[PDB]
């Protein structure tokens, strides 16, 4: 019943699990291992990866889930495709990307998020939208063809109409503080789980598009990679320090005027700027962004 897997190298370590590059006796696969204590996170990701309506080229390919008894107890595994180029944060740290790379990475990221957010399958059938809630460059994988691929669904929320308004309150602010929308940092959301939770994902996507743009040679002179707000906040910033920047100071990652000399870069910058607007209603949808990138 269990797959013939040999773990090779630890390639990732998140809040809930360890990710290993492994040999499947495909040959190279990724194995995400959750201890028994993190069963809930394993189940949450398993439910997304197993959903036939969530199979998409810009969502990490799933092979199978397994329960593996160990001496110390039991581990819960998620076996997926392995992307050798690694996560987007690591990729952008090492590489200066081309305009073509930026277009492919940006468009594929917007397509993946638009698919999660969609209330219908491509064939028109209704489907319950998913909000990622932890969109960031370390949660995006770079495929060999230089397109994006979403992963790390441990904090994702299925926009189920049965969701309690009071239960969503604490819960509290979920995700990574650095990428939290101003309305999340402000504790200013309503139990309108629909367009409102989708808008928080679009804000985080804007910061990621900024990261991709900041490492694109089409801007002219490219600086060393820095995460969003890297020059203003500490390595693991708290919600309070982020609120002081994003909300109180209306701070956003810098877009030097010289970036706008390239027509394509100018279009990407105008788009991501609309997506990180203070007002969630002024933001474009992920589908709008996917359309703007196809126009490029």
GROMACS .gro file of C-alpha atoms in nm:
model
  296
    1UNK     CA    1   0.000   0.000   0.000
    2UNK     CA    2   0.292   0.240   0.078
    3UNK     CA    3   0.504   0.384  -0.206
    4UNK     CA    4   0.873   0.280  -0.242
    5UNK     CA    5   1.023   0.613  -0.126
    6UNK     CA    6   1.378   0.695  -0.010
    7UNK     CA    7   1.419   1.041   0.152
    8UNK     CA    8   1.728   1.225   0.021
    9UNK     CA    9   1.752   1.584   0.134
   10UNK     CA   10   1.564   1.828   0.353
   11UNK     CA   11   1.463   2.104   0.101
   12UNK     CA   12   1.207   2.290   0.320
   13UNK     CA   13   1.096   2.351   0.677
   14UNK     CA   14   0.768   2.537   0.738
   15UNK     CA   15   0.551   2.596   1.047
   16UNK     CA   16   0.385   2.252   1.025
   17UNK     CA   17   0.606   2.023   0.820
   18UNK     CA   18   0.942   1.926   0.667
   19UNK     CA   19   0.977   1.887   0.288
   20UNK     CA   20   1.222   1.639   0.141
   21UNK     CA   21   1.347   1.577  -0.207
   22UNK     CA   22   1.296   1.199  -0.238
   23UNK     CA   23   1.351   0.903  -0.465
   24UNK     CA   24   1.042   0.713  -0.580
   25UNK     CA   25   1.163   0.361  -0.689
   26UNK     CA   26   0.845   0.920  -1.150
   27UNK     CA   27   1.189   0.914  -0.980
   28UNK     CA   28   1.226   1.253  -0.805
   29UNK     CA   29   0.927   1.357  -0.587
   30UNK     CA   30   0.872   1.596  -0.295
   31UNK     CA   31   0.757   1.448   0.036
   32UNK     CA   32   0.601   1.683   0.289
   33UNK     CA   33   0.607   1.519   0.635
   34UNK     CA   34   0.380   1.628   0.914
   35UNK     CA   35   0.411   1.491   1.269
   36UNK     CA   36   0.090   1.356   1.431
   37UNK     CA   37   0.062   1.695   1.624
   38UNK     CA   38   0.011   1.873   1.287
   39UNK     CA   39  -0.257   1.633   1.155
   40UNK     CA   40  -0.501   1.928   1.100
   41UNK     CA   41  -0.261   2.105   0.860
   42UNK     CA   42  -0.194   1.778   0.672
   43UNK     CA   43  -0.574   1.719   0.636
   44UNK     CA   44  -0.632   2.081   0.518
   45UNK     CA   45  -0.368   2.052   0.240
   46UNK     CA   46  -0.476   1.691   0.154
   47UNK     CA   47  -0.837   1.811   0.099
   48UNK     CA   48  -0.716   2.079  -0.151
   49UNK     CA   49  -0.468   1.856  -0.333
   50UNK     CA   50  -0.731   1.574  -0.361
   51UNK     CA   51  -1.004   1.808  -0.499
   52UNK     CA   52  -1.056   1.727  -0.871
   53UNK     CA   53  -1.182   2.090  -0.922
   54UNK     CA   54  -0.845   2.224  -0.798
   55UNK     CA   55  -0.624   2.049  -1.056
   56UNK     CA   56  -0.457   2.330  -1.251
   57UNK     CA   57  -0.117   2.386  -1.412
   58UNK     CA   58  -0.046   2.666  -1.161
   59UNK     CA   59  -0.129   2.454  -0.852
   60UNK     CA   60   0.134   2.204  -0.732
   61UNK     CA   61   0.067   1.852  -0.878
   62UNK     CA   62  -0.039   1.599  -0.612
   63UNK     CA   63   0.051   1.226  -0.619
   64UNK     CA   64  -0.089   1.081  -0.292
   65UNK     CA   65  -0.122   1.117   0.086
   66UNK     CA   66  -0.001   0.846   0.325
   67UNK     CA   67  -0.005   0.765   0.697
   68UNK     CA   68   0.329   0.615   0.803
   69UNK     CA   69   0.381   0.445   1.139
   70UNK     CA   70   0.722   0.528   1.295
   71UNK     CA   71   0.897   0.414   1.619
   72UNK     CA   72   0.817   0.754   1.784
   73UNK     CA   73   0.452   0.744   1.660
   74UNK     CA   74   0.303   0.824   1.319
   75UNK     CA   75   0.381   1.066   1.035
   76UNK     CA   76   0.142   1.205   0.777
   77UNK     CA   77   0.285   1.248   0.427
   78UNK     CA   78   0.187   1.445   0.117
   79UNK     CA   79   0.375   1.331  -0.194
   80UNK     CA   80   0.380   1.582  -0.483
   81UNK     CA   81   0.578   1.680  -0.794
   82UNK     CA   82   0.926   1.811  -0.718
   83UNK     CA   83   1.032   2.146  -0.872
   84UNK     CA   84   1.413   2.154  -0.882
   85UNK     CA   85   1.430   2.537  -0.930
   86UNK     CA   86   1.282   2.567  -0.578
   87UNK     CA   87   1.062   2.836  -0.430
   88UNK     CA   88   1.029   3.183  -0.586
   89UNK     CA   89   1.201   3.362  -0.295
   90UNK     CA   90   1.510   3.139  -0.333
   91UNK     CA   91   1.490   3.170  -0.714
   92UNK     CA   92   1.475   3.555  -0.708
   93UNK     CA   93   1.757   3.568  -0.446
   94UNK     CA   94   1.990   3.380  -0.686
   95UNK     CA   95   1.869   3.509  -1.027
   96UNK     CA   96   1.807   3.829  -1.223
   97UNK     CA   97   1.508   3.747  -1.447
   98UNK     CA   98   1.424   3.859  -1.801
   99UNK     CA   99   1.112   4.056  -1.908
  100UNK     CA  100   0.982   3.726  -2.067
  101UNK     CA  101   1.042   3.540  -1.730
  102UNK     CA  102   0.854   3.820  -1.545
  103UNK     CA  103   0.557   3.792  -1.786
  104UNK     CA  104   0.540   3.411  -1.750
  105UNK     CA  105   0.587   3.414  -1.367
  106UNK     CA  106   0.341   3.702  -1.311
  107UNK     CA  107   0.070   3.561  -1.542
  108UNK     CA  108   0.095   3.206  -1.401
  109UNK     CA  109   0.075   3.339  -1.040
  110UNK     CA  110  -0.244   3.543  -1.122
  111UNK     CA  111  -0.396   3.238  -1.309
  112UNK     CA  112  -0.333   3.006  -1.007
  113UNK     CA  113  -0.492   3.251  -0.760
  114UNK     CA  114  -0.783   3.326  -1.000
  115UNK     CA  115  -0.849   2.945  -1.022
  116UNK     CA  116  -0.854   2.912  -0.638
  117UNK     CA  117  -1.085   3.218  -0.609
  118UNK     CA  118  -1.323   3.111  -0.888
  119UNK     CA  119  -1.682   3.014  -0.788
  120UNK     CA  120  -1.701   2.790  -1.099
  121UNK     CA  121  -1.507   2.520  -1.284
  122UNK     CA  122  -1.390   2.603  -1.645
  123UNK     CA  123  -1.698   2.397  -1.760
  124UNK     CA  124  -1.937   2.629  -1.562
  125UNK     CA  125  -2.021   2.406  -1.259
  126UNK     CA  126  -2.028   2.579  -0.913
  127UNK     CA  127  -1.727   2.520  -0.683
  128UNK     CA  128  -1.652   2.656  -0.336
  129UNK     CA  129  -1.376   2.924  -0.365
  130UNK     CA  130  -1.054   2.887  -0.165
  131UNK     CA  131  -0.852   3.176  -0.027
  132UNK     CA  132  -0.485   3.090   0.021
  133UNK     CA  133  -0.426   3.327   0.321
  134UNK     CA  134  -0.047   3.279   0.315
  135UNK     CA  135   0.056   3.396  -0.031
  136UNK     CA  136   0.428   3.487  -0.036
  137UNK     CA  137   0.730   3.414  -0.256
  138UNK     CA  138   0.841   3.122  -0.032
  139UNK     CA  139   0.494   2.956  -0.094
  140UNK     CA  140   0.531   2.972  -0.476
  141UNK     CA  141   0.737   2.714  -0.673
  142UNK     CA  142   0.923   2.781  -0.997
  143UNK     CA  143   0.862   2.510  -1.261
  144UNK     CA  144   1.131   2.419  -1.520
  145UNK     CA  145   0.945   2.622  -1.790
  146UNK     CA  146   0.965   2.937  -1.566
  147UNK     CA  147   0.591   2.941  -1.481
  148UNK     CA  148   0.458   2.956  -1.115
  149UNK     CA  149   0.300   2.694  -0.915
  150UNK     CA  150   0.108   2.749  -0.578
  151UNK     CA  151   0.175   2.532  -0.272
  152UNK     CA  152   0.154   2.541   0.111
  153UNK     CA  153  -0.223   2.537   0.164
  154UNK     CA  154  -0.199   2.473   0.543
  155UNK     CA  155  -0.367   2.807   0.631
  156UNK     CA  156  -0.613   2.813   0.336
  157UNK     CA  157  -0.985   2.869   0.388
  158UNK     CA  158  -1.269   2.715   0.191
  159UNK     CA  159  -1.531   2.995   0.156
  160UNK     CA  160  -1.810   2.773   0.295
  161UNK     CA  161  -2.147   2.954   0.360
  162UNK     CA  162  -2.177   2.755   0.690
  163UNK     CA  163  -1.864   2.941   0.831
  164UNK     CA  164  -1.939   3.108   1.165
  165UNK     CA  165  -1.877   3.487   1.181
  166UNK     CA  166  -1.767   3.454   1.547
  167UNK     CA  167  -1.531   3.158   1.471
  168UNK     CA  168  -1.347   3.366   1.201
  169UNK     CA  169  -1.269   3.632   1.469
  170UNK     CA  170  -1.007   3.424   1.666
  171UNK     CA  171  -0.870   3.247   1.434
  172UNK     CA  172  -0.739   3.609   1.446
  173UNK     CA  173  -0.491   3.741   1.190
  174UNK     CA  174  -0.374   3.436   0.997
  175UNK     CA  175  -0.072   3.420   0.770
  176UNK     CA  176   0.266   3.591   0.756
  177UNK     CA  177   0.265   3.947   0.904
  178UNK     CA  178   0.495   4.087   0.633
  179UNK     CA  179   0.236   4.004   0.361
  180UNK     CA  180  -0.085   4.092   0.552
  181UNK     CA  181  -0.325   4.341   0.389
  182UNK     CA  182  -0.385   4.675   0.572
  183UNK     CA  183  -0.747   4.572   0.658
  184UNK     CA  184  -0.613   4.247   0.818
  185UNK     CA  185  -0.344   4.442   1.017
  186UNK     CA  186  -0.618   4.694   1.115
  187UNK     CA  187  -0.862   4.412   1.228
  188UNK     CA  188  -1.111   4.596   0.999
  189UNK     CA  189  -1.275   4.306   0.807
  190UNK     CA  190  -1.651   4.208   0.813
  191UNK     CA  191  -1.800   3.849   0.814
  192UNK     CA  192  -1.834   3.905   0.432
  193UNK     CA  193  -1.603   3.608   0.371
  194UNK     CA  194  -1.648   3.631  -0.012
  195UNK     CA  195  -1.491   3.926  -0.208
  196UNK     CA  196  -1.333   4.048   0.119
  197UNK     CA  197  -1.103   3.740   0.186
  198UNK     CA  198  -1.020   3.723  -0.192
  199UNK     CA  199  -0.904   4.092  -0.167
  200UNK     CA  200  -0.652   4.007   0.108
  201UNK     CA  201  -0.495   3.740  -0.120
  202UNK     CA  202  -0.475   3.999  -0.406
  203UNK     CA  203  -0.285   4.242  -0.176
  204UNK     CA  204  -0.028   3.964  -0.088
  205UNK     CA  205  -0.005   3.875  -0.462
  206UNK     CA  206   0.081   4.247  -0.535
  207UNK     CA  207   0.380   4.226  -0.299
  208UNK     CA  208   0.496   3.905  -0.474
  209UNK     CA  209   0.458   4.076  -0.820
  210UNK     CA  210   0.672   4.360  -0.676
  211UNK     CA  211   0.939   4.103  -0.570
  212UNK     CA  212   0.945   3.952  -0.926
  213UNK     CA  213   0.959   4.308  -1.081
  214UNK     CA  214   1.245   4.414  -0.847
  215UNK     CA  215   1.464   4.137  -0.992
  216UNK     CA  216   1.378   4.192  -1.360
  217UNK     CA  217   1.669   4.325  -1.577
  218UNK     CA  218   1.413   4.526  -1.783
  219UNK     CA  219   1.407   4.779  -1.489
  220UNK     CA  220   1.770   4.867  -1.576
  221UNK     CA  221   1.999   4.846  -1.271
  222UNK     CA  222   1.880   4.559  -1.042
  223UNK     CA  223   1.953   4.561  -0.665
  224UNK     CA  224   2.017   4.251  -0.452
  225UNK     CA  225   1.691   4.070  -0.365
  226UNK     CA  226   1.517   4.189  -0.047
  227UNK     CA  227   1.173   4.072   0.075
  228UNK     CA  228   0.894   4.339   0.079
  229UNK     CA  229   0.964   4.599   0.359
  230UNK     CA  230   1.312   4.442   0.412
  231UNK     CA  231   1.467   4.790   0.468
  232UNK     CA  232   1.201   4.899   0.724
  233UNK     CA  233   1.117   4.596   0.946
  234UNK     CA  234   1.308   4.322   1.133
  235UNK     CA  235   1.359   3.963   0.997
  236UNK     CA  236   1.041   3.815   1.159
  237UNK     CA  237   0.816   4.125   1.194
  238UNK     CA  238   0.513   4.131   1.423
  239UNK     CA  239   0.164   4.247   1.325
  240UNK     CA  240   0.217   4.575   1.529
  241UNK     CA  241   0.537   4.672   1.339
  242UNK     CA  242   0.372   4.585   1.005
  243UNK     CA  243   0.058   4.789   1.098
  244UNK     CA  244   0.284   5.092   1.173
  245UNK     CA  245   0.430   5.065   0.817
  246UNK     CA  246   0.144   4.940   0.592
  247UNK     CA  247  -0.145   5.108   0.769
  248UNK     CA  248  -0.021   5.414   0.972
  249UNK     CA  249   0.251   5.522   0.723
  250UNK     CA  250   0.061   5.384   0.412
  251UNK     CA  251   0.400   5.229   0.328
  252UNK     CA  252   0.457   5.002   0.027
  253UNK     CA  253   0.775   4.859  -0.135
  254UNK     CA  254   0.958   5.127  -0.340
  255UNK     CA  255   0.903   5.164  -0.717
  256UNK     CA  256   1.187   5.396  -0.840
  257UNK     CA  257   1.073   5.619  -1.132
  258UNK     CA  258   1.350   5.475  -1.358
  259UNK     CA  259   1.168   5.132  -1.354
  260UNK     CA  260   0.881   5.293  -1.552
  261UNK     CA  261   1.107   5.365  -1.861
  262UNK     CA  262   1.029   5.010  -1.988
  263UNK     CA  263   0.664   4.996  -2.115
  264UNK     CA  264   0.606   4.641  -1.984
  265UNK     CA  265   0.752   4.719  -1.636
  266UNK     CA  266   0.531   5.035  -1.628
  267UNK     CA  267   0.215   4.823  -1.701
  268UNK     CA  268   0.316   4.562  -1.432
  269UNK     CA  269   0.384   4.842  -1.177
  270UNK     CA  270   0.052   5.020  -1.246
  271UNK     CA  271  -0.129   4.681  -1.203
  272UNK     CA  272   0.045   4.573  -0.879
  273UNK     CA  273  -0.006   4.930  -0.734
  274UNK     CA  274  -0.383   4.900  -0.790
  275UNK     CA  275  -0.365   4.554  -0.622
  276UNK     CA  276  -0.204   4.687  -0.302
  277UNK     CA  277  -0.443   4.982  -0.259
  278UNK     CA  278  -0.543   5.062   0.102
  279UNK     CA  279  -0.908   5.017  -0.003
  280UNK     CA  280  -0.981   4.645  -0.076
  281UNK     CA  281  -1.259   4.753  -0.320
  282UNK     CA  282  -1.008   4.951  -0.533
  283UNK     CA  283  -0.798   4.634  -0.592
  284UNK     CA  284  -0.822   4.437  -0.918
  285UNK     CA  285  -0.933   4.071  -0.897
  286UNK     CA  286  -0.672   3.795  -0.965
  287UNK     CA  287  -0.873   3.728  -1.293
  288UNK     CA  288  -0.825   4.103  -1.394
  289UNK     CA  289  -0.448   4.065  -1.336
  290UNK     CA  290  -0.435   3.739  -1.536
  291UNK     CA  291  -0.610   3.931  -1.824
  292UNK     CA  292  -0.364   4.228  -1.805
  293UNK     CA  293  -0.066   3.987  -1.828
  294UNK     CA  294  -0.222   3.818  -2.139
  295UNK     CA  295  -0.245   4.170  -2.297
  296UNK     CA  296   0.136   4.199  -2.239
   0.00000   0.00000   0.00000
